[PDB]
Amino acid sequence: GQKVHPIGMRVGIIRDWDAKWYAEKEYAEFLHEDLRIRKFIATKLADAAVSTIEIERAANRVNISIHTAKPGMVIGKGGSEVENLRKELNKLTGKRVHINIVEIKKPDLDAKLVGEGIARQLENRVAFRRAQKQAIQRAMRAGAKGIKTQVSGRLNGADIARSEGYSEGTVPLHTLRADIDYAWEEADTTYGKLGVKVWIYRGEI
RNA sequence: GCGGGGUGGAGCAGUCAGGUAGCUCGUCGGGCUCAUAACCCGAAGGUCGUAGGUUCAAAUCCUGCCCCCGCAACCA
RNA sequence: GACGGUAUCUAACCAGAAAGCCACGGCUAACUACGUGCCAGCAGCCGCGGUAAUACGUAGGUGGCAAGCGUUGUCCGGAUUUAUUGGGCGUAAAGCGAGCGCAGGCGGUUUCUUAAGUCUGAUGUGAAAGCCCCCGGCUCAACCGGGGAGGGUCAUUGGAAACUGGGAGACUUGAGUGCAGAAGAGGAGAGUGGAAUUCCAUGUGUAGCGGUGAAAUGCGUAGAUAUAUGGAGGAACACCAGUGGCGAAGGCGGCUCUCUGGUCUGUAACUGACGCUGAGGCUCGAAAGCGUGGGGAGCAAACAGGAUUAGAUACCCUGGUAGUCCACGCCGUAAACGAUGAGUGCUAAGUGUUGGAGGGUUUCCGCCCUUCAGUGCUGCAGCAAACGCAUUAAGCACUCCGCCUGGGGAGUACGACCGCAAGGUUGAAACUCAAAGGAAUUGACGGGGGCCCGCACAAGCGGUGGAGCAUGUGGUUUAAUUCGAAGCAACGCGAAGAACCUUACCAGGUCUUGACAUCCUUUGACCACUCUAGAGAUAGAGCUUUCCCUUCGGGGACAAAGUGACAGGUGGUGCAUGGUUGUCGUCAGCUCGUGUCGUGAGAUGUUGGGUUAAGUCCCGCAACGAGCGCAACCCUUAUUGUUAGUUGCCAUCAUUUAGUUGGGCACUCUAGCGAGACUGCCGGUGACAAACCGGAGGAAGGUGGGGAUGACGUCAAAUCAUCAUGCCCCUUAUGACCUGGGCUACACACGUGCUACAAUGGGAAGUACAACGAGUCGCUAGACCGCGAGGUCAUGCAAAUCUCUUAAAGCUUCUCUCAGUUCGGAUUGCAGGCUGCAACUCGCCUGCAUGAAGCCGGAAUCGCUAGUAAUCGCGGAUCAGCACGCCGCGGUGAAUACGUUC
RNA sequence: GGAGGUAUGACAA
Ligand SMILES: [K+]
Ligand SMILES: [K+]
Ligand SMILES: [K+]
Ligand SMILES: [K+]
Ligand SMILES: [K+]
Ligand SMILES: [K+]
Ligand SMILES: [K+]
Ligand SMILES: [K+]
Ligand SMILES: [K+]
Ligand SMILES: [K+]
Ligand SMILES: [K+]
Ligand SMILES: [K+]
Ligand SMILES: [K+]
Ligand SMILES: [K+]
Ligand SMILES: [K+]
Ligand SMILES: [K+]
Ligand SMILES: [K+]
Ligand SMILES: [K+]
Ligand SMILES: [K+]
Ligand SMILES: [K+]
Ligand SMILES: [K+]
Ligand SMILES: [K+]
Ligand SMILES: [Mg+2]
Ligand SMILES: [Mg+2]
Ligand SMILES: [Mg+2]
Ligand SMILES: [Mg+2]
Ligand SMILES: [Mg+2]
Ligand SMILES: [Mg+2]
Ligand SMILES: [Mg+2]
Ligand SMILES: [Mg+2]
Ligand SMILES: [Mg+2]
Ligand SMILES: [Mg+2]
Ligand SMILES: [Mg+2]
Ligand SMILES: [Mg+2]
Ligand SMILES: [Mg+2]
Ligand SMILES: [Mg+2]
Ligand SMILES: [Mg+2]
Ligand SMILES: [Mg+2]
Ligand SMILES: [Mg+2]
Ligand SMILES: [Mg+2]
Ligand SMILES: [Mg+2]
Ligand SMILES: [Mg+2]
Ligand SMILES: [Mg+2]
Ligand SMILES: [Mg+2]
Ligand SMILES: [Mg+2]
Ligand SMILES: [Mg+2]
Ligand SMILES: [Mg+2]
């Protein structure tokens, strides 16, 4: 049967909102501005390993914390790339945008980054078992208490879609205290979308 | 010409011996069933072939008429 | 010298004239594109082809072979698939139903002899050519030549004597006889005994009896059933009785007698291999059946009637003929079964029991030991596909016999023999299939079993099904009635808001780089607005017409036009998909690692004894651990310490109409931090455990209540219409704009709801107590007008401050008086209120008027186990307006649970 | 614990 979103289950229990601002009359406007900001960043830095976007609002200002495993690539030489990003975002939003980059130590423990890697490899027609196996190995080396991965769709162009998954360690989705990260990524192939799901259980809080 | 029959869709009662239109199957609707059958609950369907008489009253009695069925319509 | 100017040799010239066939899914070496779409077609078998075909056709490649390649035909092989080499017959095909036996096959020990078999030598022959071995010739090879070898169940002849056979003896172990014993439903014949049934006779006696799931038929007042005494006759032999006995098998059970077979144990007197098997034959052979003649109680095909059933030529009931019985004679078949031919020898044990024998005891009885022949059970070695067999082999061996060779057709057809007949014995083919089959494994299932749980049933309360209306659906209708959902798990569902928009549908009016994108574009404003026509989209005029920098060349930001790439599909496929969700179900399960077991699929763990809500825990266990689940961590609710004390609270005080004001936060309250509940403690039960029962304390006790949380998976479940997306289709149209209409239709069927049918009520008046939530052009106070819906002015509040908001049931009085009503409030007329550009299609609401069905609802069916059902309101999401739906809140507040058969 | 006797359900997927 279906399962609650692993993150949504824990938001407000041990995980916090990414959109870290408060507003009453401008709630809808700020929320949609944030969504457009997130979409724009996703398009812009697609090649960079951008995972989490934390948005804070201070009056007309907007502070944006971007976590990435390639801070140099995001920054550019002498901050050229981050500065170009700021100007484009200022045009987009209509207000001062301050950007703060964060280094994602241990990229192997980020659900979105691991899932993105598997999706990229599938697009390149790597064996799905190989992609998932090496992802699990890297995660365990990084020190995840457990990891779980799943790929669904027309695997290897088969006419009947199915789901193939692997896991290692412990991933107790029902234990609320457990710090379990999750992310869903899609790989666009010749036969259509393949869904990639990654659960990463770190040290519980 | 001799008989037998026309009563709900079908098969039948009732008719002699006037008072009250039924039985079996069927049809329609709803149930039961995963579904169908069976089963269960409701409902419809004829003014008794037809026209006249008799009667207080006719599916029932009388007369005619029309349909349907079997038989006969000629023998040395 | 026919061949013949032939072979051959020499010299000149030229890569120039000289490579196809089949195959490429697996078997099988060889792979991709199109086209195709269960069509065309391929194919030796498996099998390919249903819109993404390495299997079809073409193409490009690749593999095999090559002047050949492939197809068909036929033979051998593979085929151990006729097994001499070299198979089998318990359950896969296969042991005749059993025995008696002629011929035949085979045969115990040993002395001598013989030399038929057997072994061996010599000789003769087994032509030549051809295979094979050496050696040669053609340029090689093919081919040719020379010399050898081989090839016989060969003939003659010489040897050997182990084995088989013959001949002459000997032997006693096998076989049989004698002698002494043992048991027995062995057979045949003639008698005979008791219980019971039925019938007959006679008493008593009265209204039933009998029978089924329930009934009926039937018997009975012409006296039944019952009951008592008798009589008749038939069949079978209770207790004993026992994997007990006996028989070759079929089979044989009261008792007695007569006739009669076999078996077993001793003994070692006798014979001295006389034995085993045994085609064909012969004999015997359950039950049913057949002929002749008897007999006939009970039972009982057929048959009759009563039931059951949709039907019931059956199961059930009441009767009942043949038959069952006897004699004689046929028949000759059975799952005639241990589904296992007979004989013989050999290969651990343990333990019953039948019939014996010997011994050591024991006074006897009896106990112990040994031993033979049966008969069971358990179990090594060994065997087996496995199940299993295992001194009573399916083990190890030898002899003889019967029998099997894929399934069906078929034990059929024809023929023959036998039979009175029924039929039996013998026994094919055409044709057709790629399976049939045995054992075991995992699931699923069972009108199998055991143990359990859930508002599953039971116990209860209230409903739906009946009526009106709201609402969804089917059906029908329509220009359209947009699309999706179809048992549980579709149908107050997507839709948390269809007059317009929404809107995807229809009619009509319209447009074509397009309503919306990115890229090139240019002599830059775009818009916006006024007027005109239009239903509007739109068009036709006027109207105004751009920002940002740099050094000034321009550029960048933005329109807008031109232009082509392109856009755009709520077009299709949820049987190509991602994502999301339903569902079993919050049920306790689902699995993995290592190890071990099994030939193997698999198994174990996860099972078992307890225990739990739980695969929860404990214990035991070839299992030891682990993971996803379970539980916990989380939210809310139930008590409370403390920090805080306004916008909240008011006890202490004084004042106000007012918690008002002052004053204080004490209380409540609010919300952070904590405390608290852990079977923690006590008693009893329990395997010293888990745990279970009870107790104390406490606000709360065993998960306190509730929520969130939904394992691996299941239904090609749902969604291409949230979104995204492979492939397919449309592209001046399936795309886009506008007006109107539709989605709201209405002979009918269903689901879900609301309102009722009244007195536990209707109406009137008075009076009291909540909670969750919402609020800026929004909640709206207060006042005034209005019968009312509402309207006017106007106030506070971005809110624990103000408002929505004095909640309704409730309680107290009055009235109605059982009435289709003073119930009911549908439909309808008129008149209004709002919201909105607009209320006809088609909104909600108000007043007056009208006053529908409805008198508690068939078959059937639903929810709920406590602050629950029932009932009463209040808020909110969507939202200009519009809910009987949904989400949430509080008020009042029960009945019942014996119990798990269904 | 074991052993001999006493109503229906096209076809493919
Ligand atoms: K092939
Ligand atoms: K053989
Ligand atoms: K036999
Ligand atoms: K000889
Ligand atoms: K005897
Ligand atoms: K007879
Ligand atoms: K037998
Ligand atoms: K014995
Ligand atoms: K055949
Ligand atoms: K009702
Ligand atoms: K209803
Ligand atoms: K689906
Ligand atoms: K799906
Ligand atoms: K294992
Ligand atoms: K507190
Ligand atoms: K779509
Ligand atoms: K699509
Ligand atoms: K329906
Ligand atoms: K309703
Ligand atoms: K009253
Ligand atoms: K309207
Ligand atoms: K509203
Ligand atoms: Mg190959
Ligand atoms: Mg081909
Ligand atoms: Mg052969
Ligand atoms: Mg068999
Ligand atoms: Mg057999
Ligand atoms: Mg007989
Ligand atoms: Mg009978
Ligand atoms: Mg036979
Ligand atoms: Mg024995
Ligand atoms: Mg009940
Ligand atoms: Mg109703
Ligand atoms: Mg509902
Ligand atoms: Mg519309
Ligand atoms: Mg329109
Ligand atoms: Mg299990
Ligand atoms: Mg567990
Ligand atoms: Mg265990
Ligand atoms: Mg849990
Ligand atoms: Mg489907
Ligand atoms: Mg569908
Ligand atoms: Mg589409
Ligand atoms: Mg509708
Ligand atoms: Mg009444
Ligand atoms: Mg319950
Ligand atoms: Mg309530």
From Swiss-Prot:
rRNA-binding listed as a keyword: yes
Family matches, as InterPro entries: KH_dom, KH_dom-like_a/b, KH_dom_type_2, KH_sf_prok-type, Ribosomal_S3_C_sf, Ribosomal_uS3_bac-typ, Ribosomal_uS3_C, Ribosomal_uS3_CS
Family annotation (Pfam families): KH_2, Ribosomal_S3_C
UniProt keywords, alphabetically: Ribonucleoprotein, Ribosomal protein, RNA-binding, rRNA-binding
Annotated SUPFAM superfamilies: Prokaryotic type KH domain (KH-domain type II), Ribosomal protein S3 C-terminal domain
Described function: Binds the lower part of the 30S subunit head. Binds mRNA in the 70S ribosome, positioning it for translation.
Subunit structure: Part of the 30S ribosomal subunit. Forms a tight complex with proteins S10 and S14.
PANTHER family per the UniProt record, alphabetical: 30S/40S RIBOSOMAL PROTEIN S3 (PTHR11760), SMALL RIBOSOMAL SUBUNIT PROTEIN US3C (PTHR11760:SF19)
Protein name: Small ribosomal subunit protein uS3
Source organism: Enterococcus faecalis (strain ATCC 700802 / V583)
Organism phylogeny: Bacteria, Bacillati, Bacillota, Bacilli, Lactobacillales
